[PDB]
């Protein structure tokens, strides 16, 4: 298993305009970030302070928003994640940059994305 420990903590190391966060109630997250009326292209990069090895890519589709977090930079590969029904557990950053134009955004919708509208 995995989920066992964790109570109340806070960590957010930033020195620029980074759009990375830790434990953000994904359930309630879609209530806030799911107010944006943009296309399935407004994504964020935060995960959990509960999942030791947990990174999620958040989207902002034109109905809702999501959180893809299951596997981080491991020694068996790199960014190990996909979607509700995908298997792309490989590179991300480098791919995201270039493929930002036409990558694997959200499940079956506007795969194209850019940034999010929350902080800056």
């Amino acid at each position: 298993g995995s989920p066992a420990s964790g109570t109340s903590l806070s960590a957010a190391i930033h020195r620029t305009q980074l759009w990375f966060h830790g434990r953000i109630s994904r359930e309630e997250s879609q209530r806030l970030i799911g107010q944006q009326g943009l296309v399935d292209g407004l994504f964020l990069v935060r995960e959990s302070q509960r999942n030791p090895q947990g990174f999620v890519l958040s989207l902002c589709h034109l109905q809702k928003v999501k959180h893809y977090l299951i596997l981080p930079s491991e020694e068996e590969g790199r960014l190990y994640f996909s979607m509700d029904d995908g298997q792309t557990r490989f590179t991300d950053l480098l791919q995201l940059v270039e493929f930002h134009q036409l990558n694997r955004g959200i499940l079956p919708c506007l795969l194209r994305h850019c940034c999010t509208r929350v902080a800056l």
Binding site: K66, I70, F81, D84, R89
Partner: peptide, 10 residues
């Protein structure tokens, strides 16, 4: 199953 997340409930 129980969680939510994606790729799997986590």
């Amino acid at each position: 199953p129980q969680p939510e997340y994606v790729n799997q409930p986590d």
